[PDB]
Each structure stands twice: as C-alpha cells, then as structure tokens.
Design a protein around this ligand. Structure first.
Ligand code: 2F1
Ligand code: 2F1
Ligand code: 2F1
Ligand code: 2F1
Ligand code: IMP
Ligand code: IMP
Ligand code: IMP
Ligand code: IMP
Ligand code: K
Ligand code: K
Ligand code: K
Ligand code: K
Lengths: 354, 354, 354, 354
C-alpha cells in the first residue's frame, strides 16, 4: 500500500457559504498583515517576476495600499536602484508608507546572497523576500538563520513551502512571514516536471494552522485566476495574496504591449523558464497574457470582489472573515453552474474573462 | 483544518429513479403553490429581468397558468404601467387569475423602496418580489418587516438565499415564499467574482426542509438548462421554478430578434452586468441566446418534460411527486451516457439543444 | 435531506481485473440465453429501430448466432411480412435456428396491441419484445398478463426497466426475459428531458440480482460504445446485449449510405424522436452515424473483444466469466490513460474510432 | 451487488509532498536495479517496439546508463544481428556494460520461442524480456519454467501483469523482474477493446508489495507522459520505467522524420495494431509523434525532472526516495492548477508540451 496522506483540494473545489450580514461591501475593512510588523491597507502583493514587478508596478502597488516585490533577475546595483526609485516617489489615501513617509517595497533574494541583502538593507528596503523552489531545505533555512543573526529586526519573508512541517521549520528559524505555494502558478510546471506539489487551498490551510502557533502570517502565492480565489484564500486563513498573471498585463508591468491577430498582450514568463534563466531543466514557461490596462483598475475590480465576498459572509474585517468562513465542497457540475453557462457572452465584463 | 460543512450537489449530479406507475403524463396534475395564498396552475415563473419579462411575457405566463415578475430596472411610473397592462388584458383554460378575473402579475422591488411598493399595491399587483444579491441581510429583513407591518395581507416573496438559517430568518419575518439561488444563474458570475454560493440542488433541499416548518413555499431560481432540471427541482421539494435564459429568446420577451452569422438570437443579460446597471464591480454578464419562437411552445415542451418525469415516477400530482421521489447520484461518465453521445445530431429536437 | 439511494456507476467508471488464465480467446465459448427457453450462439441483439433492424439485418444477426428484433414502426401486415422474410431465408455454422431449421427472429410490440401479437405469432415469430419507455407500469404489466394468459408458451421479453422492484414485478407476471436500460441509448434524451434514469452498469447489476431469483435472463440495452462495454455488461450479469448505434451504419440496416463532406454515413434516429413519431415532446434525436460496412465484420470485431476479455479473465464461458469477474472503479484520469493518449492516430483501427 | 475490489488511481490522480531536503538534484544518485542481478546507472528502458528500439536506440540507451530492449517483430537471425551490433559498439561515463566491457542489451521474446532464446543467448544478450498481453497465463508461466530450467542463470523479465496474484505466480516461477502495465500505453486500446486493465499507479503499488517479498524488481511499463510520472512511478516502488512514446520521436529510433503541415514527426505504433501485425482484432493503433531530436537530450530532460523530484523530497537515492515518499490525492481542479493555466505559451519548453 502507498502512503496517501490525504485528498487535497484547491480553489475550484470549494465555495464560501453566505451567512447573515449587517455589512455592505463598501463598509468592510480590508487592512491586513504582511509580516509580524508590517501591515497592508489592502492584501495584494505583486509577484517578484521580471514581467510583473519593477519600480513602476511596485510604486502603484504601495500607493494602493499593497506591496510590490522587486524581482532579483538583475545585478545587485540595479535592484538597489529599483528600490531607491520606489522610496523616492490625497490622491492616494490608502498608500502603504514607512517611517520617512516613503512607499514601502519588497525585494527578492536567493540562497547565500548576503551581499545583495546588505545592499538592499542599506538602500532602505522594507522587507526581504527569500524565494526558492524549495523553501523547506537546509540551504534556505541556513540563509534565514544567517540573515536574522545579522539583521535581527529586518522583516524577512521566506518561501515557498507547502506543508505544516516546512512552516514549523521556517517559523522556528525566525521568519516574519512564510510564503505558500508549490506549483500552483499559472506559468509553473513544477508539479508536472517533478510530480511534486500540494493543491493550493489545502496547502494554505495546513500551513496557516502551523504558522498561527507563532503568530506568523501566511502569504498565499500563485494560482489566483479570479477575485473569488483571493477571497477564498484569505477566508481559509492566509493574511495576504501574491499575484503574477493578473498583474502582468498592466501598463505598469515591465515591457510593452504588442498586438497579435487583433488582440493586445504583454509577455509573462516564469522565473524558472529557459528564457528567464538565460543544459537547463526548466520548471516554468514563457507566455503572453491579455493587456488589461492600469494596475489601479485591475486592483479595483479584485478588491471589489473581496468586498462583495465579505459582505455575503457578513465579515466586518479580514479577521472576522476568517472566523465566520464556512466552506462547501462542490463537484465538477457545480463548477460549471458557477461559471457563465448556456449563454454566449457578447460584451465582456471587466472582472470575468472566459 | 478548514470548516467544510458538506459536499454539495447540483442538478447534473443526480437523477430520479423510475418507480411503479399507474399514471400517464397527460393525466398528472401540475397545479402548485407560488406563496401561502397564491396558487399556480403550472409551476413556471419568468425571471424579473429586462431581457425576459415585461407585460407581454407576463401576460402569456399567466395565461398559461404560471406567472411573470415585471423587472424593476425602470422608474416607478413605468413599472406601474406594466402591471396595469397585464391586469387589463376558452383559448386559455389554465389561465392564472385574481378576484376580478384579471391575470395575476408579480413585480420586483429592492431594499427600502416603499414608494415603489405603495404604487404597485395601488396598481393591483398580486405579489411583490423583494430581490437582493443577499437576501440573508439586515437590509432585506428590515424591508420585509416594514412591508408586512404596513401591508399584512400583501403576498411578499423574498430572496435570494441559499442556507437553512437564511430561510428561517425570512420565514420568521413573515414572508409568503422564499426564493432560492445564489449564483446558479446562466448569466451570473457571483460565485466566481466573490467565491460565494451553494450548488443549486443542495441549496433547494436545505431551504425547503427549513421553510416547510412554516408552510412557506420555496421558489428555485436560476440554473435551469433543461426540462429535466425543473422536474428535479420540484422533486427535491421546491414548489415552483423561476427561469431566465430559457425564456429570453422568445417573441414575447423585450427586445427584437437579430441574425448573426446565419443564426437568430435575442440579447440576454444579468441585472448585475455593467450594461444593465447603466467604477462598478459586476456580478453578471451581457450575452445572447438563440431565438426559440413563442413562449407558448417553449412552455409546452418544458411542461411535457415535467409530465413525462412524474409519469416515470408514478406521481399523480406535485405533492405526490415530492413524497415518491428517490434520487441516485451519478458520475461524470453517467452524465455523458445521459446526454446524446456517439451520434451526430442532424435534425435538432425542440427540447434538446447541444 | 433528499433521499439519495446510492451513487450509481456506468461502463466508463469500471474495469475488469485480469486473472489467471488457462484459455486463449479462440477457445472460450460465447453461447448464452436470450430467454428462459431460447439460446443464442453469441450474445448480440440488434435494436428494434427503423434505422437498425428489418429483415436484412435480422437475417444476418441470426446467421451469426444472435438475433434481430424487427421494429414496430410499421403496420401489422408489413411487420408480419418482415418476419416471414427472415423465416423464409456450412457458410453460417453458428446460425440461430428454430424447430423448422428456420432463422429465429424477434418482433417489437407496444401496450395493448394484441392484434399485432396474434398476427406475429401466426407468422411464426420466435419472441415478442414488448417495449415501452416505462416497463414498470400498469399498462405494460397488464399487457404481459394478457399475453401470457393467452399464449402461455410464447417467449415474451418486456422492457425497459432500471430497478430491482421493476424486475420483480415483471418476473412475477411471467416474462421470459427483462430488458434493462432507461436513458443510456446514444440517441436517447430521456434522462435530460425528464431527469429520470439509472446509469447503465448500476442498472444491470441491480436488475440481474433480482431477476436471477426467477432464473430470468437480463438483456442490457443501450449505451454500448465499444466491445469492452459488452464484456463489462455480460461480466456484471447480463445474459445478452442489445445494440443500436454500432449496427446502424451497416450495409444491412435499412436505408442507404450517403456522403457528406467526404465521409460516408447512414441515418440513425431514436424511436422517440419527432422524425420517427411522424405537439409532441420527444425523448430522442435524429442523427447520422459513420458507415462501417458489413454486419459480419462489425460483429466479428465486437465478438473478438469479448473473446479477448474472457481470455484476460480466464473464463471458459459466459457463466464462468460472470463468477470470476472482479471490477475496479477508476477515475477520470484512469479513463484518459485507458484511451489512446499523447499520440495522433494516422491509420484508424477497425475496432476503435476516436 | 457487483464485486468492486477497490477504487484505483493513476499518475494524474496523485502528487508527491515536498519534505525536508539537504540535497540538491545534481547530488542525488539514480542508480537502480533492472533485475536481481543487473543494475542500471539510470532507471530508463526503451520499449520493445519496432518504432522505438533497434540497435541505434539500444546503444544510446545503454551509453546513457539505461537499457534498450530490441523488439521481436523480425526473424531470429535479424534480432540476433541487432543484439550483436549493440555488443560490438570518457564521453559516456555512466555507460551500462557487461563483463567484456560491452554495452548491455535486452531482447524481446514470446511464448514458446525457445529457438529465438537459444539464438539470443548465444549472441550474448544480457536479458530476455518475455512479453505477452497477458503475463498471468499458463502459456507465459510454462515458458518461464522452461527457460529457467534450461538457463538457470539467464536474467529473465516477464510481463505484463497488473495484479498481486500475477506477480506472485511469476516470482514463484523464478523470474528476475516483473513488468507492470495492462493498458496504460499511449498507443494501447486493450482497456477499451476488452474492458480489462488496472490504472497504472495502483497496478505498480499492488505488484511491488508482492514482488518485494521475493526481492524481485518491478518495471513500470507504459503511460509515462512526463518526467513527473517517472518520479511518481519510482516513488511508489517501481525500480525502473519503460518508455515508448517519449522515445519514438528521436533520431535514433527506427524510421525517418517527415514533415506534415509544417510539423516534424515520426511514426509510432503499438505492436498489437493491424499495421504491426502484418481477420485480426487489434489492441493498439498506428500513429505519429512529434520529432524531438536526440535521445541524449530527451533523456537529459527526463532525468532532470527525476533529480528535481528527489530534491524536493529530500531523497539521496532511489531507495531513500521510496521510503520517504508521501502522496496526496488531488482533484480534477488540482490537475488543472498543476498544469500551465490562464496563460498562452509562446515559446515552448523542452520538457513540457501542451
Ligand atoms: C519557483 C521555481 C520552481 C523556480 C524558480 C527559478 C528557477 C527554478 C529552477 C532552476 C528551474 N528549478 C529549481 O531550482 N528546482 C529545484 C528543485 C528542487 C530543489 Br531541492 C532545488 C531546486 C525554479
Ligand atoms: C443578483 C445579483 C447578484 C445582483 C443583481 C444586481 C446587482 C448586483 C451587484 C450590484 C452587481 N452586486 C451586489 O449588489 N452585490 C452584493 C453583494 C453582497 C452584499 Br451584502 C450586497 C450586495 C448583483
Ligand atoms: C424509448 C423511449 C423513451 C420512447 C420511445 C418512443 C416514444 C417515446 C415518447 C412518446 C417520446 N415518450 C414516452 O412515451 N414517454 C413516456 C414517459 C413516461 C411514461 Br409513464 C410513459 C411514456 C419514448
Ligand atoms: C501488448 C498487447 C496487448 C498486444 C501485443 C501484440 C498483439 C496483441 C494482440 C494479438 C492484438 N492481442 C492479444 O494477444 N490479446 C490477448 C488477450 C488475452 C489473452 Br489470454 C491472450 C492474448 C496484443
Ligand atoms: O518558473 C517558475 N516556476 C514555478 N513557479 C514560479 C515560476 N515563476 C514564478 N513562479 C511562482 O508563480 C507565482 C505567480 O503565479 P500566478 O499568480 O498564478 O501567475 C509567483 O509569485 C511565484 O511564486
Ligand atoms: O446579474 C446577475 N447576477 C447574479 N444573478 C442574476 C443576475 N441577473 C439575474 N440573476 C438571477 O439569475 C436568474 C436567471 O437564471 P437563469 O434561469 O439560469 O438564466 C434570475 O431569476 C436571477 O435570480
Ligand atoms: O428515442 C428513444 N428514446 C429513448 N431510448 C430509445 C429511443 N429509441 C431507441 N431507444 C433505445 O436505445 C437503444 C439503442 O441504444 P444504442 O445502442 O446506445 O444506440 C434501443 O435498443 C432502445 O432501447
Ligand atoms: O499494441 C499494443 N497494445 C497494448 N500495449 C502495447 C502495444 N504495443 C506496445 N504496448 C505497450 O505500451 C508500452 C509503451 O507505452 P508508452 O510509453 O505509454 O507509449 C510498451 O512498452 C508496451 O508495454
Ligand atoms: K453562474
Ligand atoms: K443518452
Ligand atoms: K491506453
Ligand atoms: K501550474
């Protein structure tokens, strides 16, 4: 007999039940925690990818109350430059600011890049995001120990993990948040290339339960296709959500729009695709996503879905949302009924593309 | 661990078992209850949408023994006008009439629109349909209390809900029927935009069980794709069914037919689509449905399927249908076997479009 | 709570396990029982449809050791004529013959058509097939009683049923076989139009268990897409299988081949389609199936699959096949792995069309 | 009631959980056992098919540390010739060699072909692969007995089986490895034609458990679509994997590339297809697969996925991989999330084609 630990679910497998509500969606509060010490005025973080976040995206993210993580596929001096650009930036009331009244920013690092870390810290970065394919490893854990030993009060996010044991090891090493998601990313092939991963909803749930013991927030990273998924991710216990594909088609993301066969697009590619890495064995693809206009407008629709959700559940804030949330498991047939069905769409909605 | 209340099913997940029958389908009775006090000679209600029901559709609906609900996306004086048109309308033996021998009609209202309610009541409307995205809310419940306090004998339908607790709160507030369906509508994106909803078959079953305690009928609204679904909905305990997409392509629905690429259509759109509401965060889309001719002919095929169903089950009437009904859960493979399979359709059937 | 009797499976949901075998497929015996008194040299029956079986198909069926049922969508005098043509027909060693050494034939009848029955009996028909949408009804059961009372030794098949209770009622009325299948037919829309049916594998299993108590064979009718399905149907306990779509494209079936867009076809339609019945509420469609050549060649491939199957299981004959058979339930993913996958077919196989 | 032994899973139904890792993928060891006495420096075997393995493919396979099995669809003298070509062949450090320092090779045989066996043995073949549609049969078992009685120290692989009982019978007869897979092959139609088979992951698991009692390795043959599947197969307990479709499009496989509609391909067909066998009842199809270049490069990507996998699990070698492995069952929705989703691929990856 093979050891099957459980049957794991992801977003399309569950729904939230409506509950008694005394709140309208414009009234709910959506402030949350990025780390033990850093709060967000809204729970969205743009992914640390070279087709998603550099200074322009990071600036808008923080202006809107979230955060951008500057990717690390560039040399130390450039990444420092990108950070300083964000730091040096009534129209944006919910802006997410540091002590100097400057916009907050995150910056990605890898294993054993203490040089990069020194430079980013001196440049005034708010949080360092230590990302790896496998956060549950000696390499990553040694790096956390080295960083916290050298910078005891630097906010450090570490990822990516998918199990409770992984969350424990990272929290015990002293991280300020853990990032969850092995393989759910739109451009990610890890689960297919290696056969390894945990469906995202189950992964978040397992990791939150363990991380809560340390009061360490969980970041749910990857696999968000719609606003409803953000709601579900937050409802199950994640404190924030990290998004790549939904933000890659924006004005502010790196790169320019192009038109192919009468549609507008931008490139979007995984950091583990051959393209991004330049024989290599990739765990990501290079692709394109539809052009969707301003980051502002995209975030507005996403947050509106979250607001709507909390309204349906009766939650006044994210914490209240998490305690009230009840899920129902659905079937393939229920997924179809949930989507648009038996009607051809003639005017596309801003928040639902089929 | 995440709190999963249950695994919920919708229509495509179940079938009715055939049982011993002494009745032919032309002999079964299909009279039912719309509310505590209002009966239907057949269990179909046309949806309160600006692409489905105005006076023409409402008139035909009631003539055929059902009801139409005039939508509320128009000013008070127009909606009053639409109601009066229905009231002022041997060829139609099963017609559904009031005390004056006039056709019955429903008219939709929202939260805190008592002005609209006064006007509709004075115009002689038979039932007011208080619709909201979230019927299980203080807003809706306060409105019910205010309406029943002012008009103790006005038949009031309230919706939409999807849980037993929601049904209890509404029944205790004094409603005459509850309307069930969060997210199953063909043009509805609520479940995707907010992540909230309950698969329709499970939702009806849960709400009926609670509503029965008060002798309050349940209206199953949305997600009907075929005549079989109506049968299933009634069999599980709903007293009537509300239909949008299947009636939107009729002569009688508002709007005109147009031809696109050699097919005939009519527009059909959700009331929560951007189009219908005129930044906004929609929960519906704008679309088109095939043109299907007269309301008469469509209803004939639908009711024929219901009749056939009750025959197979051996039910002499809807009440008997509900007590005899036994379901079987099926699989994806069983759904395929159920549909047409392994043959290409060359002459389309009136009651089955693939 | 809704009364769900069980979770029902159909063919694509199961596989047979291989077992220890001392037999090759050319050595297994495939004789079986059509009814209590009539045996087949092979277990296939062609459906009683006006696009499948008239004299030519029936003749070939019996020559090959099976049976054809002449459809009843024609007047009494014509159907009598078709029967007499079969009766009046070393090249066909396994031929299925009566007392006169004439080919056996079946002929369909409906409720209260005793006139048709007298005429068919006098014409020398071997078995009368009383078919109805709902075999579990007073109409059908009264007809069985009337026929067995008048013709105590006439072999009577009655259908169609899908439950154990239905099988009991028919067996107690004195039928010689029961026919199983509500809604699995390729051209059938009953499950969608009325919401009523039982997935075919579960239906056979339930009915066999009850019918065995009376020593009454079960005929599994409808839903056969491939040779493997025949094997599964027989393995679960059915004594024979009735086939429409797989035989409709043959030389011998009524009608001529035509070519459309470079492919050859024949018409195939349900008896409850509008076309076949000539307002009406159909439970079938009119369609087309690929032209597949001779009945001989089609049956050869089908029987070869059965032979192969019994080989894999180690069965020396159908009875032995039924006692040895063990199933495994599979998943959607297992179904994909089972089919051809990840390769494009360039030369089509005679026994597998994708 | 029908006897359902279990619900069986295949590859797409499971994932491996990540665990704590102190190893990088370039450090894990991938040596394994082909049989009791023959080791591989890497766990891949090319299928014994006339579109996959003759001398050129076999030579490269062994050079890379695996093995090729020369197919038997040719006369004895030719197959002997192919074997001698392999035997007569620092650039290939991991090469898989015999006592003479010559490349190892396998050669396929059928039931009662002792003549072929004598010739292959005298030609110096390293392992004889006795393949049959049904390894669990008197024919196959008698052949094993005859071969081991005549050649007690000749390494004999026998297949194909799918049950624990089949594994027991073969191990007790004295085989050196068993080969597992009834019906999962890309070009295989056995499960559809006969209704018989076991989903590959369940089949391996069941057979390994029994074979381990004898210290007999299990070869998982067929159904491998991606590198992740190899990992999963090894993780569940198989000692090696046999591959057809993934190697059929290589330079080294028999046949030439051709271009059709702007894509490059090679033919790939089952040994039980009509084409390969030349009325016959096939259990395979003739098809085409994309041209993928050198065997070297394909194997590199496959092994890279395995290495990556073991890294994620923390396994230092295959044996350690097997003891650490924990699976999670996923849903259809989880499979979608696992694949690339919601992005159009613009530059294809070498190790992931959609
Ligand atoms: C986010 C992922 C998966 C990512 C990002 C960048 C590069 C990569 C590559 C190099 C393709 N894969 C990669 O680094 N995989 C890996 C697997 C297991 C262990 Br232990 C360590 C590393 C992967
Ligand atoms: C039927 C629905 C969902 C509908 C109909 C019209 C408009 C809308 C819009 C405005 C898009 N959505 C809407 O009113 N949503 C909503 C969600 C939760 C709570 Br609490 C209150 C309202 C929704
Ligand atoms: C095999 C079927 C379903 C069939 C064949 C011919 C005609 C029909 C039609 C007339 C369309 N349907 C039909 O006879 N349906 C039916 C349903 C319940 C009861 Br009780 C009695 C009859 C159905
Ligand atoms: C690998 C398979 C299935 C294969 C390979 C070559 C030929 C065949 C053919 C001849 C089509 N099938 C075949 O030999 N089937 C078979 C089934 C049961 C028993 Br017991 C014995 C044999 C099958
Ligand atoms: O190439 C890669 N392989 C695997 N995961 C990746 C790769 N590149 C980015 N990711 C992850 O995928 C996330 C984005 O997923 P998305 O929001 O679903 O598009 C990022 O935040 C990373 O965690
Ligand atoms: O835009 C909207 N969002 C969500 N539900 C809607 C919207 N508009 C109409 N509905 C519901 O959908 C039902 C029609 O669903 P249908 O019969 O499946 O097409 C209506 O009766 C309403 O209850
Ligand atoms: O129109 C109809 N409605 C429902 N079932 C039908 C109809 N016509 C034929 N059938 C059934 O379908 C069977 C053929 O199914 P097939 O072998 O899957 O194509 C016949 O033997 C009948 O039992
Ligand atoms: O025609 C056949 N019928 C059934 N299985 C076959 C046939 N030919 C080859 N196989 C099996 O399929 C395997 C290849 O499967 P693949 O790796 O999925 O393409 C071979 O190693 C054989 O075990
Ligand atoms: K919907
Ligand atoms: K069907
Ligand atoms: K297959
Ligand atoms: K993915």
């Amino acid at each position: 007999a093979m050891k099957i630990v459980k049957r794991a679910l992801t977003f399309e497998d569950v729904l939230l039940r409506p509950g008694y509500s005394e709140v309208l969606p414009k009234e709910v509060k959506i402030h949350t925690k990025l780390t033990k010490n850093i709060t967000l005025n809204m729970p969205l973080i743009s992914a640390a990818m070279d087709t998603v976040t550099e200074h322009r995206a990071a600036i808008m993210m923080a202006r809107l109350g979230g955060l951008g993580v500057i990717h690390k596929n560039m040399d130390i001096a450039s990444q420092v430059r990108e950070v300083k650009r964000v730091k040096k930036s009534k129209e944006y009331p919910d802006a997410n600011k540091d002590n100097f009244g400057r916009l907050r920013v995150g910056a990605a690092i890898g294993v054993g890049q203490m040089d990069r870390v020194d430079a980013l810290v001196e440049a005034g970065v708010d949080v360092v995001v230590l990302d790896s394919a496998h956060g549950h490893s000696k390499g990553i854990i040694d790096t956390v120990k080295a960083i916290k030993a050298k910078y005891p009060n630097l906010d450090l996010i570490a990822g990516n993990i998918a199990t409770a044991a992984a969350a424990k090891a990272l929290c015990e090493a002293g991280v300020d948040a853990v990032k969850v998601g092995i393989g759910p990313g739109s451009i990610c092939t890890t689960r297919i290339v290696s056969g390894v991963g945990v469906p995202q909803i189950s992964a978040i749930d397992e990791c939150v339960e363990e991380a809560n013991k340390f009061g360490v927030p969980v970041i749910a990273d990857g696999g968000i296709k719609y606003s409803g998924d953000i709601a579900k991710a937050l409802a199950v216990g994640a404190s924030s959500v990290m998004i790549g594909s939904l933000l890659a088609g924006t004005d502010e993301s790196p790169g320019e729009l192009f038109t192919y066969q009468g549609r507008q697009y931008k490139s979007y590619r995984g950091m583990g695709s051959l393209g991004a890495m330049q024989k290599l064995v990739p765990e990501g693809i290079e692709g394109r996503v539809p052009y969707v206009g301003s980051i502002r407008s995209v975030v507005h629709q996403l947050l509106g879905g979250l607001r709507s959700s909390m309204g349906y559940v009766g939650a006044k804030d994210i914490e209240d949302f998490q305690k009230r949330a009840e899920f129902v498991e659905i079937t393939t047939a229920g997924l179809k009924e949930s989507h648009v069905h038996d009607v051809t769409i003639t005017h596309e909605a801003p928040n639902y593309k089929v």
